[model samples]
Target chain A: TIQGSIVAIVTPMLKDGGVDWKSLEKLVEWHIEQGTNSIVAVGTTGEASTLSMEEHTQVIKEIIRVANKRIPIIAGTGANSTREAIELTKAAKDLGADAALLVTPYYNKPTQEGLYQHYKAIAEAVELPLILYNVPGRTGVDLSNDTAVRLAEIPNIVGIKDATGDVPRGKALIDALNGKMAVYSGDDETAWELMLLGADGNISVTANIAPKAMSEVCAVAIAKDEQQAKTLNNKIANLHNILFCESNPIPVKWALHEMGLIDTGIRLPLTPLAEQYREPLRNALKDAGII
Target chain B: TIQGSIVAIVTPMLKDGGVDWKSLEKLVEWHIEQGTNSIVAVGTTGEASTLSMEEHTQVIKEIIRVANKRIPIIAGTGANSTREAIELTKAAKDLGADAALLVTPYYNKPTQEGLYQHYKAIAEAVELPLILYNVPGRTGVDLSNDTAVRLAEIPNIVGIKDATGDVPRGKALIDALNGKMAVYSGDDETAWELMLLGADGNISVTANIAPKAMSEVCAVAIAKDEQQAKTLNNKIANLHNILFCESNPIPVKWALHEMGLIDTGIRLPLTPLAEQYREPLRNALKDAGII
Candidate 1:
């Protein structure tokens, strides 16, 4: 069962594009210590696309090794191609991960049956739990709610990370697959609202920047601590809005570097926050005392 | 330099999904005979993102072989990585094609500066006449008009395929470039309008289904035959909308197959039209008188 907020951690990289294993180790250890119920590695936040396939597999292996089963290490092992996704998921299983969070194939825009078949292929090929990730904003296609319910029949096809942020859609997904599988929010802002509507947890990017608050929002909301969660959610709403001032990991990674938790080293193609958005995001950090 | 309708020709596939060389030759011959003054192979309409590097280069070579300079055969060769894009462009030049149509990289979105460096890298590496393709909706990135004007400084970066369909943006780009480069509409629906807005021509997908009508629209519009172009444009409007009822080529390929111009096979993840959309698409074709 998916419970509590889980941070989709960024793969800290050196300026030269090599993964900073030491920083990654520190992040994993810190998440466990800070009561981050679960952690996801090598997600979009982790720059999985840019990582060489070898590094992609290695990062999953390294994160699982460092986390040492202290908390669930959900490996992001998604790709547009079935063969590639299967290979990545199999590698994640071999590395002893707790679950695999697979994103819907980006760019390809497969049909519902194609999506069902894509997930079914992975579910059959790997022995681990599976989390469907549907972020159409980035992926150019959505894994519709009906497809998710159909995919739920696969024994290891456990849950979904519904990133659509359409409350009506999320509610329908939760209603359709209520007891059959778990539903998690991939978007951080509407995560609590979805959780209130039976979403199990959040596989989050916001948690990377404000772990305590995100965890608090999920914990309070999930556990029926409504007032506390609402207050916390409102407080960080600005931060949530600003975090995406640029794309995922860019703004969040910069915020972390500013907080001195990590160094300011990210990969190419994803540059640091654009200069104009930086000052405003910094203000949000100061408001939260995250600076 | 770009004054006529250009068909982004389909890559006919065998029943087993391999490239159908015989059918491809026949389609090219038919297209030119039907007054398609220019042709692009392996664009998004040609499914460039799905092709493997080997298949990609081979398809470009094969199309060039069939066209044999009857009209310009432009190869789609662009990638997220500058290095990879340069390699593909240079390879296309060596493949005996008349020009390269480089799409702005899709998944790995770069900053404007990064996009400049990306196109600049290709220009320096390949001395071929180049047409920059910008279909940001699929790519999740945009080639800002300012950046396009900056890129026009390079002699080899000769033209642009504007698919955003934002008339103001298209006109602004034309104004910004100040005739340094030719402009072509990447979208079929807006080709006539864009042609009147100083776009040199259209790289059309609709032409695959209605070559004579599409060619007539471009010819009428560019020849200042506004009344004739408007009539053809209105008649082909349903063709433009229906061909994209699903992703391009899915419907277009099926339409061509139905008309006996091409075979029925498309690759995995991009399946053929389902039974439901067929009659609706067929009716649209009937309405356009293509059926």
Candidate 2:
């Protein structure tokens, strides 16, 4: 059942925004050591949308190489075009990655049936295990629970990263799927409660910073150790909210830089974290003892 | 100021999905004859995101070629990549488009400051009249009134297309801008109300099928002939709501096809309108007296 804390890790970059290969490798190793259950490379947190195809595949390859099967590397291989999604998933499969996480087509806003066809076509074309990602907040489309249930019937269509933070909806999805497929919380703030409510794990941005704590929280929550999970989740709650004080990766990437984990470079359209958010985020990280 | 019933015209396609130049030219000609106040070559309703750069520029060029000074042509030149947006806007200017409508960067979800900078950079790079498009429903980012006002300070950034469907917010934007820049309604269902509330015009999808009615509504609304505008708007209100019974352009394309205006082709990721929506959309079209 794909379970526990999976870090939707940032793609570390140089000050000029070139991928920091050495730092990326180090981050992967650190995450593994810190008990992160799995590694999702080149996700939204990784700035996957901005990376060119060659760079995207290379990042996937780099992460898989570094993880070296110590933990599964779930490659972010989604695209707006169904054909393009197949191509990316095929590339991920060819690169020896363990699985692929496909976000719903953003901007174009496909129908649920179109979404089904898109995923079904990719699953048929590629050999890798697939996890559907439903982040409607960013993608402008939600893969409904009914659609998710239908997709779950496909053998290799394994799970979903439910980033829509509606807890009741998440509960309904979990109940509807009935362990037919895994449901991972993509929203860090609600991940613990979701795990307690029977979500399998978290595909997390918060885990990018406090990997061990996130892992511990996931394990405790999944294990139904409510008191422990609640305590740990509270300790890092500020980071959960503050890291998103801006639209993702911005504040998280900035926090990582403050913690001296990565460089200051973020791409255009997505500028570096604004000056206003920096001090507040730094205080939140320090409060969580992350800095 | 770029104003009035600016039809965000569809890019007609052959059955095999190649651009149907014959039908596209006919569409431009028909809009002009039907009193469409202006033509926006490809602002979402035209499926701008799915087209390649060459095809996009060519489509813009084709519309400009066909319009032949009969009406203004506003090219949809927005892209998530700032450099690409600049390139497209430059192309729009080079091709003689009267204006450029830049939708806020999709998927990447930039901060307000990033939104300001993105538009600022594009305005600096291209001399074309620029219209900011705020459709948070599609782009996952809202170009807030404050930022839209901030952008209005630029010499060439002429207006905004507010598609958020929040009337009070649109009112607030119109109030704040106060003629520093024009505000256009990008939401068709609310276009009449917003126009009555001082919106300059509509960059509209409903206009694709009923250009004359839309033009009348805009003219009357702008002329403060609220009674006439309301009457005309009610005639097409069902069309506005039903054309979007699916995502923008899906049902509209079907409606146009039913009217023998365009062929049955739409690009990948955005399929043709579903069968369930077809009859209802047809009824709406007939009810609006377009078919």
Candidate 3:
């Protein structure tokens, strides 16, 4: 099982908006070197929606090549179309991604039954394990705990990334799953609390800038060392808020660029983080010692 | 300006999942014959998310061809990516569509400025007049009245479809735009009030099954004949409830199949409507004189 500090790494882009392959390799190596438990490439933080299929898979390949089994690479293969999701998951599996993170169908809110069938089709079609992502705030679809339990019956459907930040709900789900599936906190602010309540890990955007800190926090959180986890997380708590000053990847990407990790290249419709939040975010990074 | 009841017509599909072109043409022809003011081909009710790009455009072209100038076809051209939305809007224009309805970028949840930039980008990229769609329930993002007013400055960013179901909010938007742009209610239940409050018309889902009634209701509402619209809308009040028994297209698709208007061919992740709601919906349809 891939557990703890799974960074939802931002996909680095050049000034011209092409995927920065060299920076991508650098970022992946840095994550592994910094002790990131796993890497989720081309996830929402990676701006998966704006990328073409080739760019999507090439990203997975690059991350996997860089990590070289030092860390697990989970590809974001979710699509509203069942066929498209299956195809992408298959591509990820073929490209050697350890697993795939599939968010619930966006915009087109499917019924709970449709959600079941959506994941079932992908699970049956692909050989790799799947992590369900439920960020209802963005996906316009909610995957209920009951449906997650229903989905756990499918062997290859291994985990879920709950971005809702409802720790009590997460606790109930973990209890209900009874270890049938792993529940990861997809929200950074609530990750530490959810972990204390038995969450397996976090699929985090804040981790983009503070990989080593996020890793250390998750490590303590995983060992059930609540005090150490709290202590570790307290220092980077500012990052959990500031990195999300804008829609994620926007602020996180800016933070990375400020750290001289990635270039100032984010896709359109998701512009670079606005200038107003710049000073505040940079200050937070300094406080967290990320700068 | 295209106005009145614009049916977001479903793309009829074979039970085996192929686009049922024969029924599709029949539905478009039926809508025109029944006096639907315009047809929004491949919009959300048309299950736009699940369709292949070819299916998406073919459905649009067929709707336009079948209408044959009797009705206008405003193709649904929204996407999470600005480039893709621009390309789809351009395709709609190329295929001789009257206008394009572009929903705000879904899943990505752009900032207000990003939203402005998104619409501006698409409006500039294509010559087709644009109708900005704000269905916060389904898109997980909203286009604020201020944003809509901001977008109106772009000459071709002509109007907006407000499916928010908030009549007062719709009124505020219309009041704010000051006829600088048109505001159409995309919610069936509240369309009457919104139109009565000076909204141009409705981009309707209920219009799929009750084209003539919707057109009549819209005509009266458009003329500010409040009593007649209220009376017309009152008769089909149950329809607004039952047709949405589930998330749009699901219940509507099932109703269409029952009426022999379309096949039981909604895509995966969107199953044929469930059984328990079946009797309730059928009873509603019968009462409404549809089935």
Candidate 4:
């Protein structure tokens, strides 16, 4: 049961747009040191879409090697092709990942039945436990609560990362699963509220820069300390909204570069943070007292 | 400008899931014979996401070779990565495709500025005439009218395929482009209305099974003969609604296979049509007199 503030850490890149392996290792170590509950490598925040398969698994392997079991490492192994997803999950399992987080197949919008078959095929094919990621905003497919409950019956399908931010929907899913599956909030702004409503944890992007604060909020929230969780979350609330003022890692990556944790390098199709967003990001960082 | 019913043709596949080249050639010949104004090979309706890059370009090449200039071929060359999209568009140009239809970067959720830069980068990199595709339902990103208008300034960025089904928005785009760009309806149910509103044509899924009917719908709609266009569209109106009974190409492929135009094959992540959909689809096909 991996729970609480699992940081979807960014993959540090050099100025030439190559993955910065040394910085990546340093980031993983830093997360563990900062008390991040778990580490999710090559997730969307890690620029998983653009990374070639070789780089993807290599990064997963490196993060696992660096974490050295101090923290659980979840590999992002989702693919649009079912066969390809199965192969990636097998690779993650072989590389010693604690679990794999598979986002709903993107671009190719699959039906609920197709979604069921996709995860069922992977769970059957691989020995690893899996976390379903339902970020319809990116994937163009929503893994419905009914379907999520259906998927929960699979022994190896252990949890879901619900990025919909619909608290009612999350609450319904959590209630429906009845502890058979863990429901993790993938949206940062609403994570605390969801946790109060019995969410297991958060698969978070806000944790990237404010890891300690996010960790504290998660700890209190998951413990059912509603008031404390809200107070702690208030400190970093601006970040949850602003880091996404642009499409994810765009603003978060720039925020990290500003913190001197990474270089000013992001790949194409995803450009460097636009100048207009720079000031608000700085203010948000200051609001969280990170600078 | 390419006008009337431009079918976003299905890439037929054998039972083994390999591209059914013989059936594909026959479908192309049939569309031309039935008066499909143009053909969009490998578009979403053709299952572009699952095809390998080699197979993607090869499909485009083969379609063009078989099309033999009897119709204009608009190749689907969009990619999440800008460099990759440039490469695909370049290949389409070199392979003698008439134009390229680029969907907004999917899954990445690029900002409107990122969207602008993505298209601008491609337009500057390739000489092929370009058509921007906005299907927020599938791509999770809407190319805003402002950005669409901005991209319209580029000489080769000649048109847009608006699949949003938001008539007012489409009208705004049509009015904004003000003849600088040709706006085509990518939604079958609404294509007639859009064409009546001055959309140049429809890149249709309904056209796959009823090419002649769709062609006449476009001809009347584009001619501003709304009474006749709606009258023609009514015959297949049930089809325009039912083919989408699932997420696109799903039910349409089933319809074509039922019609004996193609074999029963679709790639993974996209399964064969469901059993429940069969009766509704059969009824719809019969309603349109295709079966």
Candidate 5:
């Protein structure tokens, strides 16, 4: 009943790290044309960590305006502070996002009950459909399968983006939820198998560059066409590996810049991808037929 | 050359989470009376994640005003964004903090090279003594010792708070730096041993509740009177374990409130320390002669 390749799109920025509206508009339109099922704006891939709240809201607004409801825009509304998360989510809802994705509180390292309460407070504060994001590799906090199940009972808590890359865990969550919620693989490399095992789709960084292949793979895998899904997924699998050659969005943003899709702009603390990774990533892009 | 017992002090807040300046004033005066050598305002234990930038600067300014050069103040000015980190560090300098402690970027995992570059950029931008803080447990990024030594050569990058609780690594880094930088133990449990092993002092969380013990522990350890430091550190060792029974500042803040030092207002995503941990924490405080 559900198939999606949600592009965790980059916020195209100018060299000065200001949002490049022209480039961002181009990206939103590209994803819509390439059949990215849903687009995540201001996501980690979009350098959400570095953006000012004003810039965060503006990028989401521009993406929504460009897509013009032809595609769904899910705003990255997570923050380490629950007060800030509620505020960001409220802004997302006010701006007409189809859904809001909230990563678990990072850095503060909340207890499980703390995690539950954080999401509960945000869910109750805003009536929009909310997705839980668990990427412990970056956030240093894990949102357990049990916590996800507990959160699923809340009416507005709609789904989860499991980025842990553990397919068994993803399958168990999918089985436990049993359609009470959607399970989207947030890791691109493991996405194909998870989708075949019943994850609804992937919220993907790979789809940012190889949307056609990623979108097809999600469609075919979710439709249970295993053989065709395998072939298409294998074709662009290297993008998953290369886009992460450095920390994500670093390499993905570089690949986009190489393709002339976005500018050479990644905020610091995160630099532009290293020079060594640039050639290899470009080659990966070329081999994927994206360049 | 440096001996310190800097409390990574809590920012006392009202029930509605507004800054409780009267309580804060009480705390600063209390630390000065209790022999805490220095105070770190707006550090992680202060719930820095929840404060607005304006609130952060205001808190730093107030701590400086209250301490008024009688006790040194180190402002926690780290951000996952280098640009923002620079801004915060500059604000701390402008507000007259004696030094600034920048925790390695959280949530966004910068590479070793990226870490080097981040600190380098901030040190170049702000003409203030800077301490590098590496707490991989919360930040999800390891600031490698090699990177630390590399950053040590920069004039303003003057010290580091090794919070990983890995004493061997801390010792190795201390050896590597060879007084090129001051080393402070940011982990309370290991602070005694690290200081004995030549870490200059502790940037402490336990000191929030048991400042006398922590301060003496640092002084005796740094003075290398092993028996005195060991005996003293053991008396309040329980405080270290209990304080982190939940992720930091939660239990520490509660312990402070129980001691009539502050009010109950830990922001969400970080709840007040869980109910189950309260009694044990109270017991630890009593056992340490804090309550």
Candidate 6:
């Protein structure tokens, strides 16, 4: 089982809306220094949807190059269409990424059978190890546990980044594929509890703002140090809960800006944080010593 | 105030899924024959999100060419980015459409101010008569009535296609606008009631499938023929409700194909009607006497 902290790092941006690649390379170094064990590039946190194809691949290549085998680089390779996702997965493989995270199709939602075919198609198309990321809150679709078990049987399907946060589904997945395939918590707030109950680790947005503490929580929990993990998790729970104050990357991006790590350069359609959500988020950051 | 049946027409697809311009011309002619007063082309029901830029402009031009000023042909020109929406609306204006329909941002979800700015940018940048289309169920965001009234003060910001199906919001919009702008019901099931409650007209997906019935119901309501409208609306209520048995245009396209009105081709990302949904939709069609 993979056991540690994984950060869904934001692609840092300058004030002019250009991707700050220099800062991004530095941020990669920063994560490793802070004990983040893995990094997910171009995931939702990285705003994969709006990025041009060249930038999407460029960001993945840069992240992989900078991480340099020091940490596993899981590239976000999901799309609303299977053919598009397969192409993305193939691109990720060619970029020399360590693993690929494929989120369930958004918008044009599919049946469970369709979801299975979608995943199986990608697994067959790409050479890279695959980790299925199920975040239905946005995708408007759920990857049921049965589908997870079915995919676990495929040799290249190495793990699941189950974000449903439904404990029963998490437990069922752990029970069904505990030995066959790894199961990671994609939800950051409940990740420690899931870890105590046998989650592999969290591929997280929260960790971007507090990598050292999140890593310690994962380290403690995986080492059977449940008390330490729980204590640390509870301490940071306020921050975790608040980071998603809007959507992931929304608040986390704001937090990064507040912490002087990045500029407030989130793309349009996704406006800057609303004024009312700011105080609550700031208080959470203050409590966590981030502000 | 505009008061009549406004159909969000299907982009008639050929057997090969390429747009069928001949069938589209026939559909427009049929809609006019059935007394449908307005036509909204390239709205989400037309699968605007998936259409290439060239195809989008082509469809607008085709609809305008066919409608040829017979009815108000409102072009759907909305994108998540404000600048893009402005460019699209400008294009639609250049194509000689009567008005432009700008749907609220999808996926990227803008805040209220951003929403105002987005519409403001379009109104300022493009001189077209505008109708803001608010279908939050699809767009993940709502354009509030207050914002609509605020935008209404602009010389060309004509009205809104309010689809929240919230009766209070619809009523409030009518009240707030104070005759300055029109509030059209974007939903089918609630159109009769909304019209009775002061909504100017219906911008309907259901109308695409059952034009004659929708036209009859809407005409009676608009003419203050309450009893007749109720009798006609009741007759076609099952069709209105069941067209959404799946998402809009999914079942509508299926019904159109079944009736041999249009080819059975739908685009990728949105498949043909799921097999299980087919029978129920047929039953709904039978109830509406369209079978």
What is candidate 1's lDDT per residue for B9-41, written digit by digit as tens?
A: 888899878888888888888888888888887
Q: Which stretches of candidate 3 lie over 4 Å from their true place?
A: none
Q: Write the per-residue lDDT of candidate 3 for residues A40-110, one digit (tens) a residue.
A: 98999999989989999889888998888887889999999999999999999999889999999998889
Superposed on the true chain A, the predicted chain A of model 6 yields a TM-score of: 0.97
* Candidate 3 TM-score on chain B: 0.99
Query: Top model by TM-score, which number?
Result: 3
TM-score ranking of the models: 3, 5, 4, 2, 6, 1
Docking class of 5: high
Model 5 lDDT at residue A270: 89
Q: Roughly what TM-score does model 3 have, to 2 decimal places?
A: 0.99
* Candidates ranked by lDDT: 4, 3, 5, 2, 1, 6
Stretch of 10 with least lDDT, candidate 1 chain B: B105-114
Candidate 6: residue B83 lDDT (0-100): 58
Model 4 over residues A1-291: C-alpha lDDT tens digits?
898889998989998789999888888888988989998889999988778889888999999999999999999999887878998899999999999999998888999989998999899999999999999989889889999999999979999999999999999999998999999999999999999999888999999998888999999999999899989998888899899888998999999998999998787778899998898889878867999
Instruction: Determine which window of 10 residues in candidate 1 chain A has minimal summed lDDT.
Output: A264-273
Q: Which scores better on TM-score, 2 or 6?
A: 2
Clashes of each: 0, 0, 0, 0, 0, 0
Q: Measured with DockQ on alpha carbons, how good is candidate 6?
A: 0.30
Question: By lDDT, who's the top model here?
Answer: 4
Q: Every model's Cα RMSD, please?
A: 3.0, 2.2, 0.9, 1.9, 1.5, 2.9
Q: Per-residue error at B107 for model 6, in Å?
A: 2.8
Predicted complex 3: CAPRI docking category:
high
Worst-scoring 10-residue span by lDDT in model 5 chain A: A1-10
Q: Write the per-residue lDDT of candidate 2 for residues A202-266, one digit (tens) a residue.
A: 99999999999999999999998889999999999988898887898899899999999899988
The Cα error of candidate 5 at residue B160, in Å, is 0.8
